[PDB]
Design a protein around this ligand. Structure first.
Ligand SMILES: CC1=C(O)\C(=C/N=C(\C=C/CP(=O)(O)O)C(=O)O)C(COP(=O)(O)O)=CN1
Ligand SMILES: CC1=C(O)\C(=C/N=C(\C=C/CP(=O)(O)O)C(=O)O)C(COP(=O)(O)O)=CN1
Lengths: 350, 349
């Protein structure tokens, strides 16, 4: 049938009133794709929730449609967020759609090319700092406390209310809750939202409770180290975050679900990044592939038992970050003369 | 609802046997988004079919899932295509998914950066030539005449079989066929595919027949100019194509539909490109926005009368081409000290 966006489709789970604007970019309802080759190789039943087909190319659209609709309902005209790039892209698109001004603070030289192009195109006022995301978040929260500008980072609870619908959809698309929900962790709002979603669906519809398995990049694994990281690092700039704002909710999700927050190296991330594209035709940005890298690590160790039904969240479209793709990949265009014989000869001799 | 890809959902309209592999990346079923502000400013009811949310970010996935499934059914292990970038990305993804080799021939320096990243990541054998798309297609077609390599460019009929499904969806999502289907024209397969779709749905389901309104970029407007353009040009490199392989089908489609194939300038394309992102929050690549530029042109001229119900096809995701976005945009980011006081006063100023 039809799909009219999250606010309409999940209205009973959401803080929607008759005065809530009907804001939508048709976000949500993203594919849950079975990966049969990787399932065979791993000895599990692996599906990927491909959030890169959301309107701005990441799961952030789920929370942002809710946050911006409520911000407009509650009488604001300007929104602001700090971002590694996907939240600012979402905020900018929904602000333009909603006729609100948008201001974003980003870490200079540390957001992907595609995310920058979106923020420029959607019409945000873009402020860059030489600090990291964590610096930007501190500044943004201070400013929205000291101005009438509405904060639309994940600490805004409407963001997590929108993002929990991804757990609803996974249950509906799989026909049941999975054994394991594998997910990247940056600012930790998303793993918190999925867990909140699984609990609500458990209570209302009787679905089971997955083990929540979150994965930070080793260079930014503040939760795994149990310490704030003052200079987080990782090539997966989406999750280059050393003081997650939803730290306590995420640890609670892991504990209540009998799950775990783990870490993956950049090399593990980049391997999973190439793996799913080469073997399954699925292209997600590096930070997203922490979930797949996490599945490979824990299938190897037995922490994900063979035969498990596993959903890995692919949080962002691979088109967000074309530089990493070309920088790391061994595949390069070979330049040939515009001559059928040379090309055919190359085709056969290679 | 639930969605398992085009082969499953549109089986009855597709040349699908019990031998056809169940190939899917869940392509299709893309949003039809009403644009209420642009509608108001133009005096029409305008919707956009946002094909950028297909698995590889363009409508090519519709044709490619059918062409690659049929290629595997018929015994092939390799596919090949020429491309300005989106057909090669689709070909590469579906080949990977179907366990096939993929060879793509692209024009050096004339495919968008996101499309190159896709071809590399999906694992295609990428051959770049000093020539243009038309040169690459000539070579690819010649090669596939004599070698056991399946041609998956749009001269493969299975590409149009899959691509026609977009018109089916438009009718179901709108509740009726629109008065006008506005669409970019590069190699002309897609406008032919929509019209084929609209004729089929008319015969089977009684829907009406839109006017097919195609738009080439002016520097590549071979059909408008009635000439093979040896040196096609346009910033919209997706549609930088001077000898459209489906020329005759596309002229027939505009003729049978009482439509027209028109051209829009690069400045018109770029205006539409910025307009929809700024005003409606919808971001498509420059070639896609030829359809919006054409709607603006023909509303202004009266060729799309006020009150028309219009669906414009946004063929590719804006993330395909990050360079044009940052190059055209006078909106440069500003670097400020990492100080909340210093940035607060700058926001207030
Ligand atoms: C593609 C992708 C991201 O963009 C991202 C965070 N992106 C951010 C992070 C923080 C901003 P917030 O969304 O927390 O307001 C962004 O700015 O785009 C994460 C991590 O998800 P969390 O654990 O942070 O929910 C995974 N994957
Ligand atoms: C975004 C986009 C394209 O990539 C594209 C053609 N893209 C091509 C062009 C030709 C290859 P073909 O699909 O004809 O085999 C590509 O290689 O990606 C067109 C024009 O559609 P047609 O008139 O060609 O149906 C509009 N929009």
């Amino acid at each position: 049938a039809s799909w009219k966006g999250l606010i309409h489709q999940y209205k009973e789970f959401l803080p929607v009133t008759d005065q809530t604007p009907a804001l939508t970019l048709h976000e949500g309802n993203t594919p849950l794709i079975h990966l049969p080759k990787l399932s065979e190789q791993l000895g599990i039943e692996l599906h990927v929730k491909t959030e890169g087909v959301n309107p701005t190319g990441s799961f952030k659209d789920r929370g942002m449609v809710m946050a911006v609709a409520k911000a407009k309902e509650e009488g604001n005209d300007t929104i602001m967020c700090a971002s590694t790039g996907n939240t600012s892209a979402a905020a900018a698109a929904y602000a333009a759609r909603a006729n609100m001004k948008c201001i974003v603070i980003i870490p200079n030289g540390k957001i992907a090319f595609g995310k920058l192009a979106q923020a420029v195109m959607y019409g945000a006022e873009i402020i860059a700092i030489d600090g990291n995301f964590d610096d930007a978040l501190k500044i943004v929260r201070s400013i929205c406390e000291k101005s009438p500008i509405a904060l639309v980072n994940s600490v805004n609870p409407y963001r997590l209310e929108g993002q929990k619908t991804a757990a609803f959809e996974v249950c509906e698309q799989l026909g049941e809750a999975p054994d394991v929900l594998a997910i990247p962790v940056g600012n930790a709002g998303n793993i918190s939202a999925y867990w909140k979603g699984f609990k609500e669906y458990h209570e209302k519809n009787g679905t089971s409770l997955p083990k929540m398995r979150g994965f930070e990049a080793e260079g930014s694994a503040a939760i795994v180290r149990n310490e704030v990281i003052e200079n987080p690092e990782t090539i997966a700039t989406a999750i280059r975050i050393g003081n997650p704002a939803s730290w306590d909710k995420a640890v609670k999700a892991a504990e209540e679900s009998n799950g775990k927050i783990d870490e993956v190296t950049d090399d593990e991330i980049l391997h999973a990044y190439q793996l799913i594209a080469r073997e399954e035709g699925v292209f997600a940005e590096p930070g997203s592939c922490a979930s797949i890298a996490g599945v490979l690590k824990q299938v190897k160790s037995g922490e994900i038992p063979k035969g498990s039904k596993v959903v890995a969240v692919l949080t962002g479209n691979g088109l967000k970050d074309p530089n990493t793709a070309v920088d790391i990949s061994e595949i390069k265009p070979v330049t040939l003369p515009t001559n059928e014989d040379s090309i055919l000869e190359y085709v056969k001799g290679a």
